[PDB]
Design an enzyme around this catalytic site. Structure first.
Site, PDB file in Angstrom:
ATOM      1  N   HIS A  73       0.828  -1.218   0.000  1.00  0.00           N
ATOM      2  CA  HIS A  73       0.000   0.000   0.000  1.00  0.00           C
ATOM      3  C   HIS A  73       0.858   1.262   0.000  1.00  0.00           C
ATOM      4  CE1 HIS A  73      -3.146  -2.923   1.266  1.00  0.00           C
ATOM      5  NE2 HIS A  73      -3.800  -2.225   0.360  1.00  0.00           N
ATOM      6  N   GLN A 282      -4.293 -16.799  -3.224  1.00  0.00           N
ATOM      7  CA  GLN A 282      -4.648 -16.141  -4.490  1.00  0.00           C
ATOM      8  C   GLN A 282      -5.832 -16.814  -5.171  1.00  0.00           C
ATOM      9  OE1 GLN A 282      -3.710 -13.023  -5.608  1.00  0.00           O
ATOM     10  NE2 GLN A 282      -2.778 -13.087  -3.577  1.00  0.00           N
TER      11      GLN A 282
HETATM   12  C1  LIG Z   1      -8.772  -4.353  -0.241  1.00  0.00           C
HETATM   13  C2  LIG Z   1      -7.899  -4.796  -1.413  1.00  0.00           C
HETATM   14  C3  LIG Z   1      -7.173  -6.143  -1.250  1.00  0.00           C
HETATM   15  C4  LIG Z   1      -8.177  -7.196  -1.080  1.00  0.00           C
HETATM   16  N1  LIG Z   1      -8.963  -8.033  -0.937  1.00  0.00           N
HETATM   17  C5  LIG Z   1      -6.258  -6.190   0.005  1.00  0.00           C
HETATM   18  C6  LIG Z   1      -5.190  -5.088  -0.025  1.00  0.00           C
HETATM   19  N2  LIG Z   1      -6.368  -6.335  -2.477  1.00  0.00           N
HETATM   20  C7  LIG Z   1      -5.651  -7.469  -2.808  1.00  0.00           C
HETATM   21  N3  LIG Z   1      -4.785  -7.490  -3.854  1.00  0.00           N
HETATM   22  C8  LIG Z   1      -4.056  -8.625  -4.095  1.00  0.00           C
HETATM   23  N4  LIG Z   1      -3.147  -8.654  -5.122  1.00  0.00           N
HETATM   24  C9  LIG Z   1      -2.311  -9.817  -5.412  1.00  0.00           C
HETATM   25  N5  LIG Z   1      -4.271  -9.765  -3.369  1.00  0.00           N
HETATM   26  C10 LIG Z   1      -5.146  -9.727  -2.333  1.00  0.00           C
HETATM   27  N6  LIG Z   1      -5.429 -10.921  -1.581  1.00  0.00           N
HETATM   28  C11 LIG Z   1      -6.522 -11.050  -0.809  1.00  0.00           C
HETATM   29  N7  LIG Z   1      -6.533 -12.298  -0.337  1.00  0.00           N
HETATM   30  C12 LIG Z   1      -5.440 -12.847  -0.897  1.00  0.00           C
HETATM   31  N8  LIG Z   1      -4.794 -11.996  -1.665  1.00  0.00           N
HETATM   32  N9  LIG Z   1      -5.859  -8.593  -2.064  1.00  0.00           N
HETATM   33 MG   LIG Z   2      -7.704   0.409   0.518  1.00  0.00          MG
HETATM   34 ZN   LIG Z   3      -5.998  -0.117  -2.854  1.00  0.00          ZN
END
Ligand SMILES: CCC(C#N)(CC)Nc1nc(NC)nc(-n2cncn2)n1
Ligand SMILES: [Mg+2]
Ligand SMILES: [Zn+2]
Length: 324
Positions: A73, A282
Site C-alpha cells: 500500500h 490467491q
Molecule cells: C482491499 C484490497 C485487497 C483485497 N482483498 C487487500 C489489499 N487487495 C488485494 N490485492 C491482491 N493482489 C495480489 N491480493 C489480495 N489478496 C486477498 N486475499 C489474498 N490476496 N488482495
Molecule cells: Mg484500501
Molecule cells: Zn488499494
C-alpha cells in the site's frame, strides 16, 4: 532514461502498462509521473484550469504521504489503480457516458484511495482499539482516513487542484470521490456486486453498443464498481506483473500476522507465514471476490473486458497449478 520512460508511457491508455518500470524510470515517483501523464492525456489541466505547478505540488505531497516502507500500500499501488481507472473510463461500451467532472473525480479517487495506509487491515485497527477505529466507529476505518488525508492535502500551499471548479462542481466532486474511495472498503463488496448484477440484469444499450446510464444513482454505482474493480485488478494483469503484486501483498500480510502474533492475537487469514500458502490464498481471492466482480463487469461492458477476464481465469488456473 527519458526515452525509456516515454516508451513505457506508450501504454498509458492500455491495461498492463508496466508501472514497475515507470517507477524505476521516474526515480520512484510513479504516482506523480503517471498522474501528470494521465492529466495531460485527458486535457484535464486545461479543462479544469489547473496549473502544472499546483498539480505537481499536490501530487508530490500526496505521493510523500504514501508510506515507502509498506510493501504493497505504497504509491506504486496508487499509481497502478489510477492508471487502471484511467483505462476503465475509456472502455468503448462507456463512450460519452461520463462527464468531465466524473472522469476527474474517478482518477483523483483512485490516486488518493490508499493514502497514508499503515500496512494493516481494518480488522486489525478495530481489534487493537486504534484511534482511527475510534474516530470512525469501526466503519470503513482506513477508507475514511484516506479521504481525510487526501482532501486535507488540498489545503496546503499551492495544492488546491480544484480551485477553478464551480462551487457545485466542487461539492459534487467531493461527494463522488467519497463514494468511490468508500467503495474500496471490502465490507461493501457484496453490496456493490449485488447492485452491479442488478444493473447487468436491467441494462439498457444504444444501437452502437454503448451503455445507457440515465439517473445519477446508476452512474455512481458504475463508478463505485469501476474503482473497486481497479483496486482488485492485480490478478487480471499479465502474469509477470501479477506475481510482483502477489509478492508485495504477501509481504504486507505476513508482517501484519507477525504483529498479531506478538500482541497475542489470533492471526488473520493468510497472514501466518509459517503456514500460509501464497498460491491457495490467491486462488481463493479470485474465486470468492475477484472473478465474481470482474465477470459481472465484463457482462456490463461486453465484449470489451473479454481479454481482461480471460487473463484472470488463466492466472487463476496457473496459481492453482502451483499449489503445494
Ligand atoms: C482491499 C484490497 C485487497 C483485497 N482483498 C487487500 C489489499 N487487495 C488485494 N490485492 C491482491 N493482489 C495480489 N491480493 C489480495 N489478496 C486477498 N486475499 C489474498 N490476496 N488482495
Ligand atoms: Mg484500501
Ligand atoms: Zn488499494
Amino acid at each position: 532514461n527519458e526515452d525509456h520512460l516515454a516508451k513505457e508511457l506508450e501504454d498509458l491508455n492500455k491495461w498492463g502498462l508496466n508501472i514497475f518500470n515507470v517507477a524505476g524510470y521516474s526515480h520512484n515517483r510513479p504516482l506523480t509521473c503517471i498522474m501528470y501523464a494521465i492529466f495531460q492525456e485527458r486535457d484535464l489541466l486545461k479543462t479544469f484550469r489547473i496549473s502544472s505547478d499546483t498539480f505537481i505540488t499536490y501530487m508530490m505531497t500526496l505521493e510523500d504521504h504514501y508510506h515507502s516502507d509498506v510493501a504493497y500500500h505504497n504509491s506504486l499501488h496508487a499509481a497502478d489503480v489510477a492508471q487502471s481507472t484511467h483505462v476503465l473510463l475509456s472502455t468503448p461500451a462507456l463512450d460519452a457516458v461520463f462527464t468531465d467532472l466524473e472522469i476527474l473525480a474517478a482518477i483523483f479517487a483512485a490516486a488518493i484511495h490508499d493514502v497514508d495506509h499503515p500496512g494493516v487491515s481494518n480488522q486489525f485497527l478495530i481489534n487493537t482499539n486504534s484511534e482511527l477505529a475510534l474516530m470512525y466507529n469501526d466503519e470503513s476505518v482506513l477508507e475514511n482516513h484516506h479521504l481525510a488525508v487526501g482532501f486535507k492535502l488540498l489545503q496546503e500551499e499551492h495544492c488546491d487542484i480544484f480551485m477553478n471548479l464551480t462551487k457545485k462542481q466542487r461539492q459534487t466532486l467531493r461527494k463522488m470521490v467519497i463514494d468511490m474511495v468508500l467503495a474500496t472498503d471490502m465490507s461493501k463488496h457484496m453490496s456493490l456486486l449485488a447492485d452491479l448484477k442488478t444493473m447487468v440484469e436491467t441494462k439498457k444499450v444504444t444501437s452502437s453498443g454503448v451503455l445507457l446510464l440515465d439517473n445519477y444513482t446508476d452512474r455512481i454505482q458504475v463508478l463505485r464498481n469501476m474503482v473497486h474493480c481497479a483496486d482488485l485488478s492485480n490478478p487480471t494483469k499479465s502474469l509477470e506483473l501479477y506475481r510482483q503484486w502477489t509478492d508485495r501483498i504477501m509481504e504486507e500480510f505476513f508482517q501484519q500476522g507477525d504483529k498479531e502474533r506478538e500482541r497475542g492475537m489470533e492471526i488473520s487469514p493468510m497472514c501466518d507465514k509459517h503456514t500460509a500458502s501464497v498460491e491457495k490464498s490467491q486462488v481463493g481471492f479470485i474465486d470468492y471476490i475477484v472473478h465474481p466482480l470482474w465477470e459481472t463487469w465484463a457482462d456490463l461492458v461486453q465484449p470489451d473486458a473479454q481479454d481482461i477476464l480471460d487473463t484472470l481465469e488463466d492466472n487463476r488456473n496457473w496459481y492453482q497449478s502451483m499449489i503445494p
